[PDB]
Amino acid sequence: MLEVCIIGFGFSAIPLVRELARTQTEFQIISAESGSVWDRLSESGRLDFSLVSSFQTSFYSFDLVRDYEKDYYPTAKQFYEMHERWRSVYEEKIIRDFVTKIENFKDYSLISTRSGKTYEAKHVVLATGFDRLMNTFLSNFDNHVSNKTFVFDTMGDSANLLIAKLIPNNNKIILRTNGFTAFDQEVQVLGKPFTLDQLESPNFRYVSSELYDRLMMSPIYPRTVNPAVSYNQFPLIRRDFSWVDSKSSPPNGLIAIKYWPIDQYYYHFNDDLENYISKGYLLNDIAMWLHTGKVILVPSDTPINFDKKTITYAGIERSFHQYVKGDAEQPRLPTILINGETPFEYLYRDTFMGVIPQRLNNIYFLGYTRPFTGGLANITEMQSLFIHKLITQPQFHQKIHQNLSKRITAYNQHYYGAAKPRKHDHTVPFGFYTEDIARLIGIHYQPNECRSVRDLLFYYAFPNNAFKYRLKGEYAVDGVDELIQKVNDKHDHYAQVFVQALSIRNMNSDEAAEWDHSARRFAFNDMRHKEGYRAFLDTYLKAYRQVENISVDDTVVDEEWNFMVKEACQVRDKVAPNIESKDEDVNKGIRLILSILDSDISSLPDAQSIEFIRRLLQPKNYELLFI
Ligand SMILES: Cc1cc2nc3c(=O)[nH]c(=O)nc-3n(C[C@H](O)[C@H](O)[C@H](O)COP(=O)(O)OP(=O)(O)OC[C@H]3O[C@@H](n4cnc5c(N)ncnc54)[C@H](O)[C@@H]3O)c2cc1C
Ligand SMILES: N[C@@H](Cc1c[nH]c2ccccc12)C(=O)O
Ligand SMILES: N[C@@H](Cc1c[nH]c2ccccc12)C(=O)O
C-alpha cells in the first residue's frame, strides 16, 4: 500500500517532498503534463515581470541559506528557474497524468486518472493551485493595443501588472471598484530600504489586540486626516470594512496590492533603466498613476452599457476597448468522494489551518492559504512541515485530529468571528499563520525564555519567516544560524520596528494614526513623493517603449481623457494644497536599544519603556485556543 501520494507539483509541494525524502517515507507524485501558468508564460516568452514579494519571503529556507546576500525582489524568470531546478531533482518520482477523482475510505483513498490508471494511497496531499480568470489576459496579452480605454471592476496584483504594461502605450485606465488597499513594496526607515514584510513585528499581538491594531491598521483604515495619504486625496480608494468582526488585526480576508513607489523604483533602477525593465522590473506605481491621471477612480455604480461598449463620466460618452471582470480564484480540486459516494464541498473556513478538511481521512491541502503580504513560500514551507509531521508521526496526527472540529470552530471564532464566509477567507497575515503553525508543531519560541534585549528583538521584531522556525528543533535546516546573522546585521537587529511599538504603547488609535504620518516620507501611499518624479516617469516610459519595440505619438493628445482626469482628481486638487516627529522618536529609540542590546531583561531597574520591555516576558494575550 503506497504510504503518500502527492497530486500536483509546481512550487507548493517542494518542501513537503524534501521532508518525505529526508525521513525516507514512501511517496509518489502525480502531476499533469501541461504544467502551470509559469509553463505558459515561459513558452510564449512572457516571464518579463517581477514578484510583488521579497526574496526572504518567496524562496524556501534551504535555498536562502545558500543564496541570500541581500534583500531584493526576484524576477518571474528567477522564480520559474527555481521551480524548474526543483522539478529536475524530483522528475523521476513524478507520474505525468491528471487526477480526475479521489474516493476516500477510512484508511486509504482510491485516485482515478485521465489515462485510466488508478492508485491506492493511505495519505493524499493536494498541491494543485488555483484557476484564475485573469491568467488568460496575462498569458495572451496583446501589446499592439494603443490609445484604447480599459475598465477594471477589481484591483489586484494581476490587474496592477496589466496596468503597468498598458500605460506605456498611452492606454487609459478606469477603475470602477469598491476601493482597494495598496502598499509600497519597499519603504525608507531613516535612509535604509525595508520591504513592507520586515516592519509587521506580529508577535506584538500577544501584548494586546489593541496595541498591534495601532501598529498596523492606520495605512489601511481611513484613520488620519493628513492630506498627504492617497485615501484622503482619492477617497474612492477606501473600502467597506463593515464585514470585519474580529479583534485580530490585520483581519483574515483582507487582500492588498504591493507596488514599487516611484522614489524607491528610482533609487534601484535609474542608472541602468532599459536593462532593469528587460529583466522584469516594471514601474507599477498605482499612486503615481492616480496623481498623473494615467489611471482614474470612478464610483462602483458609474454609467456603462456593455452593448455599445461605453462608460459615461461627466458628459463624455467614453468608448472602451475592454472590461476586465475581476480575478476570481478557486482551488483546482478534483472530485473528492466522502466514503466514496458523497461529493466533498470545499470551503476554506471548514478546513483546519487551510490544510485539514473535515469528513475526509488522510487528505491534506497544500498551497491554498494566501499571504496578506510577502510570498507564498512562508505559508507553503510551514504547511509542508505541518503536513509532514501529521503523515509521518501518528502521535501528532491523533493530537490534532482528536478535537479537530473544536480546533476549527475556535480558529473561525478568533479570526472571522460572526462574519459570513467571504471569497478571500483564505488570506491571512503571514506572521500570524507561520507562528500559529509553529505552535501546533512545537517549533515556536517561548517569549519567557528571552534573557537579553537582543533576544526580545529576535522574538518580537525579527519577521516570522518560515526559516525563523528552522534554526533549531525537529525541522532544523543547516545554514539558518548564518542566515539569521546576515539578516540581523543588515537590518540593525530590527531595532527600528521594535522602537515603533515602544513609541505608540501609551497612544490611542487617533494619536497612533497621525504619528504614523508625521514622518517626511511615511511608509505607504505618501503623495508628497510623486510630483518630483514626473520627468523620471517620462524617461521610464521612453525606456519601456525602447525594450518592447513600441512606437507611439505623445504629440497626439487624447483631449477626451484630460477632461475626465479633472473630474476624478477634484477632492485631490482641493485637499493636496493643504500639505505642510516619528522620524525623531525612532531616531533616539534605536540609539537607546542599540546600547542595552546584550543587557539582561530581569536586571533592568524599576523612562517607562523599561517596565513595558520587562512585561514582554509575560505577554497577556498569548492564548490561542485552537491550539
Ligand atoms: C501571475 C502570478 C504571479 C504570482 N506572483 C507571485 C509572487 O510575486 N510571489 C509569490 O509568493 N507568489 C506569487 N504567485 C503565487 C504562487 O507562487 C503561484 O500561484 C504558484 O504557481 C503556486 O504554486 P502551486 O504549486 O500551489 O501551484 P502551481 O504552480 O499552479 O502548480 C500546481 C501543479 O499541479 C498541476 N495540477 C493541477 N491539477 C492537477 C490534477 N488534477 N492532476 C494533476 N496535476 C494537476 C498543475 O498543472 C501544476 O503543474 C503568483 C501567481 C501568479 C499566477
Ligand atoms: N508597522 C509598520 C509597517 C506596517 C503597517 N501596516 C502594514 C501592513 C502591511 C505591511 C506592513 C505594515 C508601520 O506602521 O509603518
Ligand atoms: N496573481 C494571483 C496570485 C498572487 C500574486 N502575488 C502573490 C503573492 C503571494 C501569494 C499569491 C500571489 C492573485 O493575486 O490572484
Residue numbers in the entry: 1 to 580, 586 to 611, 632 to 652
Text lifted from the article:
The first documented single-component Trp-FDH is AetF from cyanobacterium *Aetokthonos hydrillicola*, which catalyzes consecutively bromination on C5 and then C7 of Trp to generate 5,7-di-Br-Trp. More recently, a class of “single-component” FDHs has been identified. These enzymes fuse pyridine nucleotide-dependent flavin reductase and FDH on the same polypeptide chain, an advantageous feature in the application aspect relative to canonical FDHs owing to the omission of including a flavin reductase. The action of FDHs requires the reduced flavin and molecular oxygen to generate hydroperoxyl flavin intermediate, which oxidizes a halide ion to form a halogenating reagent hypohalous acid (HOX). The flipping allows the carbon-to-be-halogenated to be oriented toward the catalytic residue K258 and within the hydrogen bond distance to the putative general base E200, such that the halogenation site on two substrates is switched from C5 to C7.
We thus focused on modifying M216, F372 and L183 and eventually obtained recombinant proteins of triple variants including AI-L183F, AI-M216Y and AI-M216W and had their catalytic activity tested. AI-L183F, termed AetF-AIF hereinafter, shows higher production of 5-Br-Trp compared with wild type AetF (271 ± 7.7 %). Despite the 5-Br-Trp production level of AetF-AIF is slightly lower than AetF-AI (271 ± 7.7 % vs. 306.7 ± 6.9 %) (**[Fig fig2]**), this variant produces no detectable di-brominated product from 5-Br-Trp in reaction incubated as long as 8 hrs (**[Fig fig2] and Fig. S2**). Therefore, AetF-AIF was tentatively defined as a C5 Trp-FDH, which was subjected to the subsequent investigations. As shown in **[Table tbl2]**, AetF-AIF exhibits higher *K*_M_ and *k*_cat_ against Trp compared with the wild type enzyme, suggesting that the triple mutations render AetF higher catalytic rate and lower Trp-binding capacity. Structural investigations indicate that Trp adopts the same binding pose in wild type enzyme and AetF-AIF (**[Fig fig3]**). We solved the complex structure of AetF-AIF and Trp and found that the bulge that accommodates the Br on the 5-Br-Trp is missing AetF-AIF (**[Table tbl1] and [Fig fig3]**). Altogether, we conclude that blocking the space near C5 in 5-Br-Trp in the AetF/5-Br-Trp in addition to preventing the flipping of the substrate is required to achieve complete elimination of C7-halogenation activity of AetF-AIF. In comparison, variant AetF-AIF shows highly specific regioselectivity and comparable activity to the wild type enzyme.
